[PDB]
Write a protein that binds this ligand. Structure first.
Ligand code: 0VP
Ligand code: 0VP
Lengths: 10, 239, 239, 10
């Protein structure tokens, strides 16, 4: 669930 | 009257974030799949949009307060508003003259002509350009333009948002500065703030239209395979 | 002795399929995200590979018999062998001289130099080139080269294959022609067939190595977001 | 499950 969004959000 | 340091700090924080996430040379565009003048523009535009999401995300992470929201709320805000932030940030390259988006030059000059072969119809392009033109006319300051993007992104009335109250505070502390700045630093900006908020409402309709059209396109794998992982994930329906 | 019409028909069917799915002008490469000499080659190579999957799929759909397998078996065969078919088809552009892949010219000439910045290591590149060189030396005929691709793709010993028996028949009727052709039409090809089958075994190790390295790369979203929907789906682990 | 592979396979 939203793998890339997460990694980008940190 | 005049603004306070706290407010001035917010503006410098945003303006900087925008500068840091918006390349005026548009030199990154050379790395997109080449533009081509049957949905011949989809590859290049998909890349442009994916790239823009990455910038919109980078901008958010710098909006003061945003980074303290829950990872879940951050996503909910991005997924629902990214498409609007992109329409807002893209205005900085929209030209009233040629009525298009000029990004560094030819090949990256998207007239209403080439923008058609990307899978979208006039049912979106018409209101879109209408929006870009209207907005371009408000000759906003960088400060106001960047505020409007942070306000749009911090709307607590987006589906999926949990803390629809702490985000209410943030957006409010944001609308304050905008209202103030326009009062203290914008001659003839008595009816501006109201015109801007109206734009945020137009972004809601455009968002709706893009969503419908994106679904139809995205349902056809021969087309969805042209998109990028980020575009698929962000504009996807995963809860 | 000599081959039969049925066999000759198979060869013309394959050879044609290869011609129809392999552009000798490599003019489609201009549409890939530009090559760039930190994983600077990943975008362009990802596009090249995705594009290749599309060709490998198009080839399969024309291998006689393949289209009658179950949609499920067709996928199982592609997902497990696509990477090997790509290594096999890519040999047609591998050059012993410069020890690289020359596709239409510069920018599309991938030396072991640029092929490094795509996320893979020597633990793959070494055996890979070794393979390309060895294979390039068997100076196969188009007929034999295309047969080997159809044989490799119709291996019933791939995970996920249901009908591991009807596919056994097809691959067998395929190895027959190869054995025959080499006997009837290839001077000095007495020890060829055996050398070819050995290549199919090498493709198994390369497949294994690529799989390991692909997993590590694909696990890092900053990298997997550089791939394409097709590459992700085909090299993915979805059962 | 394999949306694109399917569409391409027909
Ligand atoms: C709001 C519509 C966004 C959009 C979405 C899609 C998809 O839905 C997802 C990929 C298709 C499935 C395809 C094309 C488009 C598009 C991009 C444009 O770029 C302006 C361009 C974009 C961004 C910036 C900065 O982020 C600048 C510079 O200011 C210029 C102009 C016009 C269009 C509609 C056809
Ligand atoms: C077998 C390895 C396939 C491979 C996979 C990946 C990924 O796993 C998936 C995207 C990375 C996550 C990235 C790069 C590569 C690659 C491609 C090459 O192209 C030959 C090139 C490819 C195809 C054809 C025809 O299909 C020709 C023309 O004959 C030339 C040469 C060398 C390499 C290893 C670095």
């Amino acid at each position: 669930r939203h793998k890339i969004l997460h990694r980008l959000l940190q | 009257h005049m603004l306070s340091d706290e407010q001035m700090q917010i503006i410098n924080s945003l303006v900087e974030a925008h500068h840091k996430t918006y390349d005026d040379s548009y030199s990154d565009f050379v790395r997109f799949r080449p533009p081509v003048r049957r949905l011949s523009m989809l590859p290049h535009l998909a890349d442009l949009v994916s790239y823009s999401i990455q910038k919109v995300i980078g901008f958010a992470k710098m909006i003061p307060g945003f980074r303290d929201l829950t990872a879940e709320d951050q996503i909910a805000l991005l997924k629902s508003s990214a498409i609007e932030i992109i329409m807002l940030r893209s205005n900085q390259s929209f030209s009233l003259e040629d009525m298009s988006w000029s990004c560094g030059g030819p090949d990256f000059k998207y007239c209403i002509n080439d923008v058609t072969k990307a899978g979208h119809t006039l049912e979106l392009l018409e209101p879109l350009v209408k929006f870009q033109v209207g907005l371009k006319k408000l000759k906003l300051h960088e400060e106001e333009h960047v505020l409007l993007m942070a306000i749009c992104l911090l709307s607590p009335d987006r589906p999926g948002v949990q803390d629809h109250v702490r985000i209410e505070a943030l957006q409010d502390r944001l609308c304050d500065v905008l209202q103030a700045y326009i009062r203290i630093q914008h001659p003839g900006g008595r009816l501006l703030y109201a015109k801007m908020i109206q734009k945020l409402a137009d972004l809601r309709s455009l968002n709706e239209e893009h969503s419908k059209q994106y679904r139809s396109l995205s349902f056809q794998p021969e087309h969805s395979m042209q998109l990028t992982p980020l575009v698929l994930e962000v504009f996807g329906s995963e809860v």
